[PDB]
Write a structure and sequence with these properties.
By secondary structure, the chain is of the alpha/beta class. It has helices spanning 21-28, 46-54, 58-70, 106-112, 134-144, 156-164, and strands at residues 8-9, 14-18, 32-36, 78-82, 89-93, 119-122, 148-153. It has one domain: Leucine Aminopeptidase, subunit E, domain 1. A hairpin with a 6-residue loop joins strand 4 (78-82) and strand 5. Ligand QIW binds next to loops. May form homohexamers. Interacts with N protein.
């Protein structure tokens, strides 16, 4: 039993809810919240900008030190950093950004990072300002992640479309 509430069950291990991932993280304080990161961990907008703002920019300060030491992530890669006031840990995962021409096949590699964590609160990778089709992102998630994932979808219209079209 865990503390996640109000989710629709899609499969044995995937759950989905119309929610703001920031407010959901604040309320549950999950072990892991996933950030929709870019390779530079520049958390300017989208999910990343919202998560970072909620940490009062502490996520960005930590991230800048990480990049200065380690260099950029790979598209499809991830790193574990602090969850600050939102979670124990933040798993920063880089899905391909279609608006940069990145290969959508890398979306499966991105979701494979979730399998290193037993339970996660997450957005749909490569959705929103990353330009991919969220219906496709949900399909890759379900077909790749084997651990227990709780997906937060900000847009109510999109959430209803994702549920109604789910095979
Ligand atoms: C609609 C207003 C809004 C405020 N904050 C948001 N955060 C994320 C998304 C969003 C998501 C998500 O993860 O829910 C996905 C997937 N695509 N898009 C575009 C939308 C908003």
């Amino acid at each position: 039993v865990n503390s996640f509430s109000g989710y629709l069950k899609l499969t044995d291990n995937v759950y989905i809810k119309n929610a703001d991932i920031v407010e959901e993280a604040k309320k549950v304080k999950p072990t892991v919240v996933v950030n929709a990161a870019n390779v530079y961990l520049k958390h300017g907008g989208g999910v990343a900008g919202a998560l970072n703002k909620a940490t009062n920019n502490a996520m960005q300060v930590e991230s800048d030190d990480y990049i200065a030491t380690n260099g950029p992530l790979k598209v499809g890669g991830s790193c574990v950093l602090s969850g600050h006031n939102l979670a124990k840990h933040c798993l920063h995962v880089v899905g391909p950004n279609v608006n940069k021409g990145e290969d959508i096949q890398l979306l499966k590699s991105a979701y494979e990072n979730f399998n290193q964590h037993e339970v996660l609160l997450a957005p749909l990778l490569s959705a929103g300002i990353f330009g991919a089709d969220p219906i496709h992102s949900l399909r890759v998630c379900v077909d790749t992640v084997r651990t227990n994932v709780y997906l937060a979808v900000f847009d109510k219209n999109l959430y209803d479309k994702l549920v109604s079209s789910f095979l």
